[PDB]
Amino acid sequence: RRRTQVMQRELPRTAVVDIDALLRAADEIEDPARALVAREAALLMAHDAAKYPLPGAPPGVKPVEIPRFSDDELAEARLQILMEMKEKPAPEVVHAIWNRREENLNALRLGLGYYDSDSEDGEDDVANIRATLEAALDRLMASAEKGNKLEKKLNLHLGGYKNRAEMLRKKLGEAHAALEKARNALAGFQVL
Amino acid sequence: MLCALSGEIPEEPVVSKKTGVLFEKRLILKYLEEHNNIEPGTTEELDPETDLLPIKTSRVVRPRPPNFTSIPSLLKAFQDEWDALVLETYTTREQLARVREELATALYQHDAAVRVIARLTRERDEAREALARLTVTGA
Amino acid sequence: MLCALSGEIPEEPVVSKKTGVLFEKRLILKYLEEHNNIEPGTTEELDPETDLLPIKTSRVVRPRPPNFTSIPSLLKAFQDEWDALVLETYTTREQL
Amino acid sequence: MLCALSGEIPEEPVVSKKTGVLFEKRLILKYLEEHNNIEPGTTEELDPETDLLPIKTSRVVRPRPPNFTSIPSLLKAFQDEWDALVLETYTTREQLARVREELATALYQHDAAVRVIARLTRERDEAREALARLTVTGAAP
Amino acid sequence: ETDLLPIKTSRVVRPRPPNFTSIPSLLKAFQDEWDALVLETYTTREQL
Amino acid sequence: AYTAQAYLSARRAHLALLDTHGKNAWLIGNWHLEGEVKAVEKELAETKREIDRVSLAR
C-alpha cells in the first residue's frame, strides 16, 4: 500500500523510468504546484520501478523514502477536489471530442504516441515516424523468424499426415470413378 | 459425421423421423428390440419400420474431401476469422473507450487537484509568512 | 455421409422424407426454387417445408494445414480453388 | 439499420428486449460465450433464446458495382477490404495502448497530486497550529 | 404501448454504408456464386 | 509494416493453435475421409455384386 498505485494497477506505463531526468524536467516547470506534482510523480514512478520491477526492466532499482500520510488527509483532499470539481462532461461530449481528434488528426497519427499537439515541426514528426518504422520492422522481422521456425517444425511434424491424407483422397477419387464406370456397366449389362 | 450411440461413422446410417438423430442400423435395431422401440434420451416411441428412414448418398456430384483447402471450407474459415477479428476489435474498442473516459475523468480530477494544490500552497506560504512575522515581532 | 448436392459434408444436412438423400439446406432450397419444388435427379415433387427433415448432429472440423495459416495464403488458396472449379466446369461442359 | 457490434447492416439481425440494440445472431452468441452471458455495452445478462428476438423483414438488395463482375476484380476488392480491416484493427490496438499509457500517466499525476495535497494540508495545519500557539502566547494590544 | 418495442442505436462503430465492398457481403456473394456454380455442375454431371 | 506485423501475429496464433490441436484435427479428418472412402468402396462392391449376379443369370 505504501508503493505507487500504478504499480499495483494494470497497464504499466514504462518498465524503465529515469527519476533524475524526470525530476530535472519537473524543476523546469514554471507552475509550482505542477512542478511539485511532477516531482512527486517521478518519485512515485521510481518507487514503483524499485518495488515492482516490470518484465524486461533491470533489477536493483533504488527506492525513495517518503513521509507517512494518514488516510483521513487523503480523504479530505479527495473531498476538497470533488468540491472544487466542476460539472463532468457527458460521455457523448467526450466521444465527439475523440471523434474530432480522430478526424482532424490521422488515425495512424493518433495511434502513434510521439504525435503531440505542440509538435508542429515536420522534421521531428518525420524522425519519430522513422524510429517507429524501424522498431516495427525489427519486430516484424523477429515475428517472421519465429513464425518460420514454428512453421518448419509443424511441417516436419505433419508432413506424413498430409501425405497420407493426399493419398487417401486420390484413392477415394479413383474409387469414385471406378464406381461410376461399374454402375454404367451394370446398367448396360442389365439392358443387354 | 458420427453416430449418436456407436460414436463412429455409420456404414448403414438411418434417421429417426421424430428426432432427426442419425444412428447405425444394427445398433438401433438391437436397442429397439431391447428398449421396446424407444429412442435413447427420449420417452417417445419410434417405429422401427416407419420412423426410421435410410440415408442415401448419390455419387453424381464430384466427391469433395472435407479438407481445409475446400472452397466452402475456406469461406467458412474466412467467416470465422472475420467474426473473431470483429469480436476482438469490439472488445478492444470497448476497452479503449473505457480507458479514454477514465483518462478524461482523471484529467479533470488532476486539474481540480492542481487548483486545490495551488490554493493550499498559497495558504501554506501565507501561514508561514504570518508565523515568521509573529516570531520576528514576538521578542 | 455427405451432401448429394455439394459433394462434401453438409454443414446443415437435410434429407427427403421419401428419397432420403442428404443435401445442404440452402442448396435444396435453391434447387426447389429453381425447379418448382422438385427433387433433383427424380421425377417426384419435393416439399421443402414438410418433406425435408434436418439432421441434428455434430459439425465436422477440417484439419488446418500448416501452410494454410495466413490470410494471404488463404486468399491464394481460394483463388486457386475458384480457378480449378471454373476449369473443371469448362472441362465437364466440353466432355458433355 | 446497422448492427451495433459491427457497424454494418446484418443479414439476419436480432434485437435485445431490454435496450433495443440490433446485432448479429452469431456475433452475439460468440460474445455471450466468450464473456459468460454478458450483453455488449452493458453488464446485464440477456438470454439469446428469450431476450433476443429476430426481425422478419424483406432483404435489402445491395447494389453490386459493375467492377465486381469478374473473379479477379472481386478478389482484389476482398483483399483490399481485408487489408483495410487488419490495418484498422492494428491501429485500434495501438490507439488503445497509447490511451492506456496516457491514462496511466494521468493516474500517476493524480496520485502525486493527492499525496502533495495531503502533505500540504499537514504543513498548513502545522503552520496554523504554530500561529495559534504564538497568538495565544503573545499579548495582543 | 406494450407489444411494440423501440429500436435504439449505438455509435460505438463508424457507419458503414451497405455497399459491395463489405466483408460479409463479399462472403455472401461468394457463397451464392459457389452455390450457383455447384448447381450448374450438378446439372451438367446429371446430363453427362 | 503494421499490416505485416498483424499478419505475422495472426500466423503465429494459428501456428500455436495448430500445435495445440493438430493430432485431434488430423485424426478426425482421417477418420472422416476413411469412412467416406469405405462407404464408396462398399457401394461399388454392391454394384459389382449385382452386376455379377445379373451376368450369371443371363
Residue numbers in the entry:
A (entry chain L): 529 to 720
B (entry chain q): 1 to 139
C (entry chain r): 1 to 96
D (entry chain t): 1 to 141
E (entry chain s): 49 to 96
F (entry chain K): 117 to 174
Task: Please give sentences taken from the publication describing this entry.
The spliceosome, a multi-megadalton ribonucleoprotein (RNP) complex, catalyzes nuclear pre-mRNA splicing, where introns are removed and exons are ligated together. Highly dynamic RNA–RNA and RNP networks form the active site of the spliceosome through a series of compositional and conformational rearrangements driven by RNA helicases, providing the necessary flexibility and accuracy of the splicing process. To ensure fidelity, the spliceosome needs to recognize and discard suboptimal pre-mRNA substrates while it assembles, is activated and eventually catalyzes the pre-mRNA splicing. Here, we provide high-resolution cryo-EM structures of such so far undetected spliceosomal intermediates that contain suboptimal splicing substrates, isolated via the RNA helicase DHX15 from the thermophilic eukaryote Chaetomium thermophilum (C. thermophilum or ct).
In addition to the ctILS state, cryo-EM revealed two novel spliceosome states, refined to a molecular resolution of 2.9 Å and 3.5 Å, respectively. The two complexes contain the snRNAs U2, U5 and U6 and a fully assembled catalytic U2/U6 RNA active site, which is docked into the central cavity of the closed PRP8 structure and stabilized by NTC and NTR proteins, as well as IBC and IBC related proteins. The absence of U2 SF3 A and SF3 B proteins, the Retention and Splicing (RES) protein complex and Bact proteins RNF113A and CWC27, indicate that the spliceosomes have passed the Bact state and have been catalytically activated by the combined action of PRP2 and AQR helicases. In addition to a pre-mRNA containing a 5′ss bulge, we found disassembly factors TFIP11 and GCFC2 in both quality control complexes, and DHX15 as well as DHX15 docking protein SDE2 in the ctB*Q2 structure. In the ctB*Q2 complex, we could unambiguously assign both DHX35 and DHX15 helicases, with DHX35 at atomic resolution. Within the ctB*Q2 complex, DHX15 occupies a binding site similar to that in the ctILS complex, interacting with SYF2 and SDE2, which is normally recruited to the C complex after step I splicing reaction has occurred.
